[PDB]
Amino acid sequence: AGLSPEEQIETRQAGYEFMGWNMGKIKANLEGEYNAAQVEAAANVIAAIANSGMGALYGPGTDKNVGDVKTRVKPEFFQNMEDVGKIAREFVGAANTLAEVAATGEAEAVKTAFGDVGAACKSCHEKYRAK
Amino acid sequence: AGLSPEEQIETRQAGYEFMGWNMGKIKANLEGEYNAAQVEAAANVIAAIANSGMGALYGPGTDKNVGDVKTRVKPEFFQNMEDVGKIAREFVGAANTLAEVAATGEAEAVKTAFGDVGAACKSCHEKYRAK
Numbered sequence: 001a002g003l004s005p006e007e008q009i010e011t012r013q014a015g016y017e018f019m020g021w022n023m024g025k026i027k028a029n030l031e032g033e034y035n036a037a038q039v040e041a042a043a044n045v046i047a048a049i050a051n052s053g054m055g056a057l058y059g060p061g062t063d064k065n066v067g068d069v070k071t072r073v074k075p076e077f078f079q080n081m082e083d084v085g086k087i088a089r090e091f092v093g094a095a096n097t098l099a100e101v102a103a104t105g106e107a108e109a110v111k112t113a114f115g116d117v118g119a120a121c122k123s124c125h126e127k128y129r130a131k
Numbered sequence: 132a133g134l135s136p137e138e139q140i141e142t143r144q145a146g147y148e149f150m151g152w153n154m155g156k157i158k159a160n161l162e163g164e165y166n167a168a169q170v171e172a173a174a175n176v177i178a179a180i181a182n183s184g185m186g187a188l189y190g191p192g193t194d195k196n197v198g199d200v201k202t203r204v205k206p207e208f209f210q211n212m213e214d215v216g217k218i219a220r221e222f223v224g225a226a227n228t229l230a231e232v233a234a235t236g237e238a239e240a241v242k243t244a245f246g247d248v249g250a251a252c253k254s255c256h257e258k259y260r261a262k
């Protein structure tokens with residue numbers, strides 16, 4: 001009926017990976033020729049994936065390697081769900097602000113908001129992603 | 132950024148897999164009971180990834196397996212770029228309408244727009260993806 005553990009692991013990893021491509025495209029525009037419409041579209045993807053409810057992909061047996069599929073989540077992610085929830089809400093707030101300032105076309109304002117979204121990816125990885 | 136072949140195949144598959152999870156959530160809501168806010172967030176992911184410039188992920192060298200990174204794109208894709216462009220434009224128009232209508236909360240209107248984006252996904256798979 002619903003997604004199996006191994007499918008939930010592949011899907012959250014797809015979501016994270018797609019955000020990474022869009023993060024790299026904003027960094028490449030900030031350093032080379034800034035194209036405001038390309039940054040806006042990339043920022044829009046990060047805000048949409050941050051609001052997508054990825055919490056639903058951390059269901060019961062997804063704390064371990066299942067089949068052919070390997071997870072890098074640390075077991076502490078489960079057991080610290082209020083802390084996870086708070087970092088997650090700091091991340092949708094930073095992701096929503098990037099989308100809003102990307103819409104102004106001003107690269108300097110985008111540099112700052114991008115730095116704050118980066119911070120939020122990093123603080124969750126630091127505590128909850130292995131090795 | 133200017134990605135390697137490996138990274139282009141891995142990212143395009145990650146975008147598609149994440150759009151499939153969100154399409155599955157809209158069908159679940161249409162068949163079970165509708166949570167309007169859930170459908171809006173899933174619809175906005177589809178339109179943001181449709182608008183993200185994934186055409187950039189079908190560069191040279193990406194038409195075959197690169198190392199042990201496997202791809203399911205048929206060689207035909209790369210021969211028929213005019214047809215791929217036609218399909219891809221109608222896909223982002225349809226994905227744009229799905230996010231526009233899902234924002235109203237009107238389940239019956241979401242039902243036909245969802246069918247249009249679905250049609251656009253299988254039309255490209257029928258011609259250009261192995262199986």
Ligand code: HEC
Pocket residue numbers: 009012013014016017019020023046070071072073074077084087088091117118120121122124125128129
């Ligand atoms: C927790 C609240 C997280 C936030 C916010 C972000 N990421 Fe993360 N990420 C997290 C975990 C627990 C994991 C491991 C998932 C697993 O099941 O293995 C990850 C993983 C990634 C990956 C690797 C995906 C893969 O190919 O296997 C990437 C590229 C990644 N994360 C990127 C990323 C970015 C760019 C973020 C902010 C925009 C971001 N993540 C936030 C946990 C969390």
Ligand code: HEC
Pocket residue numbers: 140143144145147148150151154177201202203204205208215218219222248249251252253255256259260
């Ligand atoms: C062509 C113009 C396409 C449109 C529109 C959509 N898809 Fe597709 N998809 C396409 C190709 C050529 C491939 C293979 C890519 C590769 O390098 O292997 C795919 C693949 C998928 C996948 C599997 C990805 C994976 O992780 O291996 C899924 C789940 C998928 N496609 C879904 C999907 C959905 C739901 C679409 C519409 C909303 C959609 N695709 C559009 C080409 C095209």
